[PDB]
Amino acid sequence: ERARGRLADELSLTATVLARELYTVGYRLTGQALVLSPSSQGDGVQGWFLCEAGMEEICGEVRGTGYEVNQGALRWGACKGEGCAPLPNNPVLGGDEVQVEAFRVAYLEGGTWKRQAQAVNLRPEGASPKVSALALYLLASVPVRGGAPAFTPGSTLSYPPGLTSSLLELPGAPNDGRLRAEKLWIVQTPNLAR
Amino acid sequence: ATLRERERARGRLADELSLTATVLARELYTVGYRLTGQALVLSPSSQGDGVQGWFLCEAGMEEICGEVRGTGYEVNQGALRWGACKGEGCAPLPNNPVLGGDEVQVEAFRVAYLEGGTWKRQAQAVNLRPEGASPKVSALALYLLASVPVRGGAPAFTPGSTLSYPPGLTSSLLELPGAPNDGRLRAEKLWIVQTPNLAR
């Protein structure tokens, strides 16, 4: 519908915000650069980076950023200082008309897609582990007049070699009449593979 | 439309405006980065504005990126729209929708600039030399207005009514539009983006 076009646009905006932020994780940093906290009920992701003022808006010091889904909203938090805790509290998307029903994050390590509790540390030797990219998934729903037909999450996705719905623990969706849309997108993480 | 429906609709629209503002802010913050030559061009009118900007890519800073990039925005066909390009003084053609163009209609976009404590809004190019910028732009102010349909209609909205202004910036500088009592629900956002690369 009109509804699906609009919701897909929200997911795109959201992806662009998240991608630009996560591409910078590990920039010029030594120490803990990323923490992934997945669960079968959904995922959290936290990252840190060095500010050089002039190049990225948020910014000569370390910053933390985070995202997770709480009570139907994708939420975001920020902080300053080495290993600071961002506390994702501000909504990005959802929590009322739009309901964000799933957020998932996987990482690419030397050609293999993984999804597990994992910290990434940067050291003179290098990154541990070597993360080339992140995969991010969002599912969301809106009410629509007269209801919409059933949605099977993962159905509209195009997957990179090796990445699966099972790795992502993609949810079921109820036949509740809500119109659903989803997005899988990949963010390269060159600062974590260096 | 009930109060509840209007609240829901308004919350959702405001969140879209916020996402949009973050996308634009992060893009415009970089304008002039490590660049010599023409870094920003503002094209305002009483019916709305266009803004174009250029910057140096350092590979490692931005996904899209050692070369010059152009970015642009304006509103047309009920969308805020964006174009990009590569190369010194390339023309970005704002084609791709950022927000709107169907259910959501973006009705107005305005850009003003802060120069040495004075807000301005006029046809203006910003040129960088190594010594610094001509003129010295500290920040940009951006305004968006958009509308959605709501079941049974919403009451009429006055544009500018919700806004909170920084010192020295005024509605008359922004030439804010009127809005019809068409039954569509409206929301708006004014936000400010610092431009350190344009202020030396």
Numbering used by the authors:
A (entry chain B): 39 to 97, 102 to 236
B (entry chain A): 33 to 97, 102 to 236
What text appears in the publication on this structure?
T4P are composed of both major and minor pilin components, although major pilins comprise the majority of the pilin subunits within each fibre. We identified a cluster of type IV pilin-like genes within the T. thermophilus HB8 genome, using the program PilFind. Three of the remaining six, TTHA1218, TTHA1219 and TTHA1222, yielded crystals of truncated forms which enabled us to solve their structures (designated here as Tt121836-123, Tt121933-236 and Tt122238-123).
Tt121933-236 crystallized in two different crystal forms; the higher resolution form, at 1.85 Å resolution in spacegroup P21, has four molecules in the asymmetric unit, arranged as a dimer of dimers. The second crystal form, in spacegroup C2, has a dimer in the asymmetric unit; crucially, the interface between the A and B chain dimer is preserved in this crystal form, providing further evidence that this dimer is not a crystallization artifact. The monomer-monomer interface is dominated by the helix-helix interaction across the non-crystallographic 2-fold symmetry axis. Tt121933-236 forms a more complex fold topology than XcpW and the related T2SS pseudopilins, with two main differences. Second, Tt121933-236 contains a long loop, from residue 184 in β10 to 221 in β11, which folds back over the external surface of the conserved sheet (marked in orange in Figs4c & d). Interestingly, addition of this loop in Tt121933-236 preserves this feature of a hydrophobic surface, as apparent from the calculated electrostatic surface (see far right of Fig.4d). Our results show that TTHA1218 and TTHA1219 are closer in structure to T2SS pseudopilins than to other type IV pilins for which structures are currently available.
